[PDB]
Ligand binder design. Structure first.
Ligand SMILES: [Mg+2]
Ligand SMILES: [Mg+2]
Ligand SMILES: [Mg+2]
Ligand SMILES: [Mg+2]
Ligand SMILES: [Mg+2]
Ligand SMILES: [Mg+2]
Ligand SMILES: [Mg+2]
Ligand SMILES: [Mg+2]
Ligand SMILES: [Mg+2]
Ligand SMILES: [Mg+2]
Ligand SMILES: [Mg+2]
Lengths: 117, 234, 248, 57, 68
RNA sequence: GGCGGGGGGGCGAGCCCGAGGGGCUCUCGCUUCUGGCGCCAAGCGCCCGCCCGGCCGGGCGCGACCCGCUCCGGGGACAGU
RNA sequence: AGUCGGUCCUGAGAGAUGGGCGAGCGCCGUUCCGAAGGGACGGGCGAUGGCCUCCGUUGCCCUCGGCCGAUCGAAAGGGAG
């Protein structure tokens, strides 16, 4: 056992994987940010309908804790429509207005009827 | 066979590199090594008092093994058979109305106070003292006490080695108290040999001032200083 | 009173050394096996200007005898070395300019520089631009050595320490009159803020023990001893003599 | 180009076909040849000269 | 039996047998850190008359202060 | 990161007797004409399942000497506190 | 908004553990009195699962891995499009 290094470095000793004996909050703390609490209002204004005629671009208001991926998940999972891209902004009254341009198949007008705007 | 060379490197200075040599003396140990390495040195620099270098005047290797086989057979009852004895004889003494199926158990005693009572009242006959109980206060009253009482004592090596005949980690002291039938003849054959070193030479052990040994670097310095001073004389 | 200027140096607030663009310290090789039983081959790559120093600053390359690696170390550029020299350093180094070697192996009369105070501290005495110690009066037993430092006070040092042979380049730097305030200003701007020589007479009662009075005069005797408290050791500190020199 | 550009270029637009390709200035290559030859001859000459120093002396 | 002898040997703390043992242990502790764990009390009498019963739950922290 | 001891070495004159030989006592060591390269072992001595006396992958020793109580130098019972 | 920028990086400096000090909240301090790498590819065995051909996942083992110390610090410096 001929130690050819002039430092005594710390020996790599065993380390255990953690195994608890019991849960520590009894249940998974469920996601309160589902595909319902993300997408609050569809926007109905002058500019956000001009988008829907000529641009195939639905406009929503989304909770600010969401991101560009979860909006695409919520719009598919509620409305059965595809999403091309999301374009988000923290609106300066506080909410996150989210401009969603759909696929070239699905129609901005027929979906606008079925949600009512 | 055909074309294999030998390439000899020259490992001198300013040329072909050094190998992976020994490097045991030259390594920065952690703080807990260099304490425990200088500490063994530090006994050998300072002049120890005679009351504590009674250790390192130890019972030799031949005698202590003869003593351990003697001490192996008064091994106390382990808690598995302490369990088994009490569960056995309680049923035996209830089925055959056993008043005494046990006369006397002979065993060695363990611990210092269980020894020191028996030495003060002449109740034990051979005393076995460990080497390495690091509070040395627990020792230096024993070899004068067994001197004044006249119970022969031995200084032996391995505080764990006393523990192995007691089923415990350290044991520090074992007093042979009640010898067997076939074992007193074993005992006086030893107590002769143990008085021969320790008890008879108590005026010699009283004045062993160990230590005061320098380092071999500076000792070799004075030995070379003898040669030139002998060159003054030659 | 208020805290004087020379007391305000000791916090290192605006008086720390301007030390960003400095190119590294200037030390020798730490004493290893090769230099104590032989010599080792090294090449000067290039010599650099270390700002805040008027001496030039060498940068010598080597080879590590224990790991396959080249080491780049920074000597002080003694006079006459050029890029591409084989500085050979160690105990049995052959006596030329630049070859650092112990004082017990050079003969007395050897004009050296960057020699060491006590062995193994990597170069302390006579480092500045144009200074030289000269080993004189060896002691064979009791391995010691008298050296004349660039003051004149013969210190005796332990003789296991090494000295790069020759004078430090930049000899006779100060012979240029600086001659305008900006060139005085730029010299000390690279060093540290030690420039404001605002005289103790011109300033007030509070801020220096000399000031005040309706005429710019001291009044207090300017020889203040070393038994003084801090912020009193002003003027000529414990001067054993004063006035203009004479002969020696 | 810039160092972060250099992941894009091909491994001909970053060096020269020579040994010591993109690192030595092609005059130092043909001086490291001449210097590594003429010193190594002097190793052999001095080894067999000092072999003859160990021969007749 | 022996806790009277430990008491009496540690009592006279100026004699030769003990002034070695005090002086080495004064060297022994000074190279260690400011606070650490002695695993068991180095005066087993003196801990025991203050409340130490040698079982689990009781720790000794050997601790160092500066004089003056 | 090669410290002090003991062994190794005539490619050494040492310092002597003296016939081969003797170590009384020393010397230290395997790099200086050049802006080159250098690591991660060659080689040997061994023990293995391998193929009938063969063939493939492994292991250790020596190559890189033994022991030892501080890493090596520098102070020193002063400085210091 | 991948390609405008913050994010990332270090500069002067600011800052925790180790350690020191302190009656004390804590201050000094930035490699200093330190067992401060948890990574690696390859050899090896042991397990595991897929299509147990062969792969894939860990267990530990031989080898290197100056760890030159964390981390913050620029919307004008460095910074792919
Ligand atoms: Mg002036
Ligand atoms: Mg002025
Ligand atoms: Mg004024
Ligand atoms: Mg005043
Ligand atoms: Mg415990
Ligand atoms: Mg685009
Ligand atoms: Mg702390
Ligand atoms: Mg701090
Ligand atoms: Mg940052
Ligand atoms: Mg910028
Ligand atoms: Mg860019």
């Amino acid at each position: 056992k001929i130690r050819t290094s002039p430092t005594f470095r710390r020996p790599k000793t065993l380390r255990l994987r953690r195994q608890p004996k019991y849960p520590r909050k009894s249940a998974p703390r469920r996601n309160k940010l589902d595909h319902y609490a993300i997408i609050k209002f569809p926007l109905t204004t002058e500019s956000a309908m001009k988008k829907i005629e000529d641009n195939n671009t639905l406009v929503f208001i989304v909770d600010v804790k969401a991101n560009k991926h979860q909006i695409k998940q919520a719009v598919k999972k509620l409305y059965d429509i595809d999403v091309a891209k999301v374009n988000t902004l923290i609106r300066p009254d506080g909410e996150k207005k989210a401009y969603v341009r759909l696929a070239p198949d699905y129609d901005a007008l027929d979906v606008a009827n079925k949600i009512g705007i | 066979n055909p074309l294999f060379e030998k390439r000899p490197k020259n490992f001198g200075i300013g040329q072909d590199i050094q190998p992976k040599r020994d490097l045991t003396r030259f390594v920065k140990w952690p703080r807990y090594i260099r304490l425990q390495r200088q500490r063994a040195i530090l006994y050998k620099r300072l002049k120890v008092p005679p009351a504590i270098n009674q250790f390192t005047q130890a019972l030799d290797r031949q005698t202590a093994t003869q003593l351990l086989k003697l001490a192996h057979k008064y091994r106390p009852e382990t808690k598995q058979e302490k369990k088994q004895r009490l569960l056995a004889r309680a049923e035996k003494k209830a089925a055959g109305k056993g008043d005494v199926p046990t006369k006397r158990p002979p065993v060695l005693r363990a611990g210092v106070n269980t020894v020191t009572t028996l030495v003060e009242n002449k109740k034990a006959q051979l005393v076995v003292i460990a080497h390495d109980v690091d509070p040395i206060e627990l020792v230096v009253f024993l070899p004068a006490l067994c001197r004044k009482m006249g119970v022969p004592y031995c200084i032996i090596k391995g505080k764990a080695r006393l523990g192995r005949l007691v089923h415990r980690k350290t044991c520090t002291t074992v007093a042979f108290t009640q010898v067997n039938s076939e074992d007193k003849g074993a005992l006086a054959k030893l107590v002769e040999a143990i008085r021969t070193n320790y008890n008879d030479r108590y005026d010699e052990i009283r004045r062993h001032w160990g230590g005061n040994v320098l380092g071999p670097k500076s000792v070799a310095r004075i030995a070379k200083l003898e040669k030139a001073k002998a060159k003054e004389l030659a | 009173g208020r805290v004087i200027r020379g007391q305000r140096k000791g916090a290192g607030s605006v008086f720390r050394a301007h030390v960003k663009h400095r190119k590294g310290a200037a030390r020798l090789r730490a004493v290893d096996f090769a230099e104590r039983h032989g010599y080792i081959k090294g090449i000067v790559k290039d010599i650099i200007h270390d700002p805040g120093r008027g001496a030039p600053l060498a940068k010598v390359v080597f080879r590590d005898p224990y790991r396959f690696k080249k080491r780049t170390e920074l000597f002080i550029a003694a006079e006459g070395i050029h890029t591409g020299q084989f500085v050979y350093c160690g105990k049995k180094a052959q006596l030329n300019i630049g070859n650092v070697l112990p004082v017990g192996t050079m003969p007395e009369g050897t004009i050296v520089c960057c020699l060491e105070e006590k062995p193994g501290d990597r170069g302390k005495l006579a480092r500045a631009s144009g200074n030289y110690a000269t080993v004189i009066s060896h002691n064979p037993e009791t391995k010691k050595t008298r050296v004349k430092l660039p003051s004149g006070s013969k210190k005796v040092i332990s003789s296991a320490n090494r000295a790069v042979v020759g004078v430090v380049a930049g000899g006779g730097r100060i012979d240029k009159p600086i001659l305008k305030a900006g060139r005085a200003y730029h010299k000390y701007k690279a060093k540290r803020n030690c420039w404001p020589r605002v005289r103790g007479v011109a300033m007030n009662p509070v801020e220096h023990p000399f000031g005040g009075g309706n005429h710019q005069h001291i009044g207090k005797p300017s020889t203040i001893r070393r038994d003084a408290p801090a912020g009193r050791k002003v003027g000529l500190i414990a001067a054993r003599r004063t006035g203009r020199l004479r002969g020696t | 180009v810039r160092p972060k550009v250099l992941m894009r270029l091909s491994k001909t637009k970053k060096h020269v076909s020579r040994a010591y390709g993109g690192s030595m200035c092609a005059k130092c290559v043909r001086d490291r040849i001449k210097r590594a030859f003429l010193i190594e001859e002097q190793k052999i000459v001095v080894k067999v000269l000092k072999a003859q120093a160990q021969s007749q002396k | 039996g022996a806790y009277k002898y430990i008491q009496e040997l540690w009592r006279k703390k100026q004699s030769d047998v003990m002034r070695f043992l005090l002086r080495v242990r004064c060297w022994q502790y000074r190279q260690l850190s400011a606070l650490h764990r002695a695993p068991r009390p180095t005066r087993p009498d003196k801990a025991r008359r203050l409340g130490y019963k040698a079982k689990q739950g009781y720790v000794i922290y050997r601790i160092r202060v500066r004089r003056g």
